[PDB]
Amino acid sequence: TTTVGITLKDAVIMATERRVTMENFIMHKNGKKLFQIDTYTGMTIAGLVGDAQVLVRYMKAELELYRLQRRVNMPIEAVATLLSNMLNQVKYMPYMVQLLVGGIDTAPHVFSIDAAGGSVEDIYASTGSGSPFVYGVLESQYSEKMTVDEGVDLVIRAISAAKQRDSASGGMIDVAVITRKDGYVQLPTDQIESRIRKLGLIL
């Protein structure tokens, strides 16, 4: 699998592929690895499917309980800290998962958490089997003076490179830009196909 998360000026963009295997044997050509975890932050998936979905369910539950108790959204440092403490209360029966949570509260963030609960701030991050490819292209092309359209084009070029050069990733890309103004918006697949055909990465 692969993930990507890119922080720019006043937004943060995350995207995954949708191919679940679960065997060698690619079994599901349309899964779901990008989740809305709250109204201003989301969470991606790059690990064992069952453990990752249980962590998504628990974090949806805990953040909704949080916002319903305090009427304020959770800070991104707080959600990564909570996720790190949860993953590190059990590490000798651990969750084989590589999580990545990003979102905006007063400034956009994207955080990475490994299977032992190591939280660390960075402006662009990625996890999964097809991770070094998207790190390569993000290192080569990424600038922090981009717009939202330039950011999502960079994301689509990244995940397209990972699909062309990796076996585990593949299938249709789904992308969701989360910003302070419009809130959590997941792009429809028709606009994503339009961006792919505009960039000329289709075959």
């Binding site: 539950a61 805990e62 909704e64 309980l65 319903l68």
Partner: protein, 226 residues
Amino acid sequence: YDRAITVFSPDGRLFQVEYALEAVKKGSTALGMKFANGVLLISDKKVRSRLIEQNSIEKIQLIDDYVAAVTSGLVADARVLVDFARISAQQEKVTYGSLVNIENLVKRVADQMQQYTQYGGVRPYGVSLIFAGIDQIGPRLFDCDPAGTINEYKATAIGSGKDAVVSFLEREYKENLPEKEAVTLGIKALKSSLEEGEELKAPEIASITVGNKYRIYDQEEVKKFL
């Protein structure tokens, strides 16, 4: 000698359960009703002194973005019970993945109140709640007794203004009704009961229409209905 502990009477009445019900007659009045495509809650807000923070005092307390609750009686038992209802709803959202029926939630909360009715060495909850929200079935509206009794209503009330409101609602309530006229009927109900302070107030009102989430009104919109 007339049995003040959770045991039975020689006619067969639970006296501590009773005495907790007359505790919740002293509470703040509140009301709910179903309308055409949803359900609304309306809570009276008797702002006694001018020192209390007028905004953040809330009786309409959300359990989820699709189930809401408003209460009457002992406010500490209210807050603890609403917290238990929140964690029970979130455990259902963990386990079964979605909140399919609000009836499971109100039955678990009512059984939690029953457990303190039942055993000895603990007083019952002196608190009465109504739940509202939509689910797979539709717009629902429950009640919750200190005994644990639940009843699903089309339109109900709770608190000190019980009897006058339920008399107004057996007289004048209609089943399917648009939201503006329904909340006008609710304000007329609350004014019909609360004509002992010769002023109503600006209360707090909330609603949901199926497919949407909760729209708790601000201070400025509720004064336009008034």
